Amino acid sequence: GVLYVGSKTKEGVVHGVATVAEKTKEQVTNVGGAVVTGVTAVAQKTVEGAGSIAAATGFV
Amino acid sequence: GVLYVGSKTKEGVVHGVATVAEKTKEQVTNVGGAVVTGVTAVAQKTVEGAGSIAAATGFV
Amino acid sequence: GVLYVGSKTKEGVVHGVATVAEKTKEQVTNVGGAVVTGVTAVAQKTVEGAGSIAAATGFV
């Protein structure tokens, strides 16, 4: 049971993501894996998870 | 039981993410894994988790 | 049982994240894993967790 009358509702809203980058430098050497990412923006209302960032084993 | 009448409701809202970067330098050497990330913005209303950042075993 | 009449409600709201960086330097050497992250902003109303940052075992 739920009712709305003239209601401005906002659920799970994202407003603006500014990620102005510059002259960066990211070097990777002799690793098991590079999992470098960037901008991650998600909008949800009813879920069982989100953005997952997982690595794995390495060896030298 | 829930009722709204002329109500401006805001649930789970994100407003603005400024991440202006510059001349950074991130070098990785002889590791089991690099899990470098960046901007992570999520908006939720009813969930069972969020942004997960996990690594894994290494060896030298 | 819950009722609203002309009420401006704000639940779980994030307003502004300024993370202006500069000329940083992060070097990683001979570790089991680098879990370097950046900006993490979440907005929730009813959940069972948040942003998790976990590492894993290493070896030399």
Side-chain angles (χ1 to χ4, degrees), chain A residues 1-46 48-60, chain B residues 1-46 48-60, chain C residues 1-46 48-60:
Chain A
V2 51
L3 171 55
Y4 302 82
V5 166
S7 78
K8 167 177 194 180
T9 323
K10 292 189 50 170
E11 311 171 0
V13 195
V14 190
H15 267 264
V17 177
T19 322
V20 183
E22 214 72 25
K23 186 183 169 297
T24 86
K25 161 171 188 171
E26 323 167 4
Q27 93 173 70
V28 191
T29 303
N30 260 326
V31 317
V35 177
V36 196
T37 86
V39 169
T40 292
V42 202
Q44 276 163 76
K45 201 255 201 184
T46 306
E48 268 85 353
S52 317
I53 298 154
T57 178
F59 213 111
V60 163
Chain B
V2 51
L3 171 55
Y4 302 82
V5 166
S7 78
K8 167 177 194 180
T9 323
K10 292 189 50 170
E11 311 171 0
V13 195
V14 190
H15 267 264
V17 177
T19 322
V20 183
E22 214 72 25
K23 186 183 169 297
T24 86
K25 161 171 188 171
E26 323 167 4
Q27 93 173 70
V28 191
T29 303
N30 260 326
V31 317
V35 177
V36 196
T37 86
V39 169
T40 292
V42 202
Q44 276 163 76
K45 201 255 201 184
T46 306
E48 268 85 353
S52 317
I53 298 154
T57 178
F59 213 111
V60 163
Chain C
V2 51
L3 171 55
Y4 302 82
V5 166
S7 78
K8 167 177 194 180
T9 323
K10 292 189 50 170
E11 311 171 0
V13 195
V14 190
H15 267 264
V17 177
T19 322
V20 183
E22 214 72 25
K23 186 183 169 297
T24 86
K25 161 171 188 171
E26 323 167 4
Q27 93 173 70
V28 191
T29 303
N30 260 326
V31 317
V35 177
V36 196
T37 86
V39 169
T40 292
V42 202
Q44 276 163 76
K45 201 255 201 184
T46 306
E48 268 85 353
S52 317
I53 298 154
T57 178
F59 213 111
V60 163

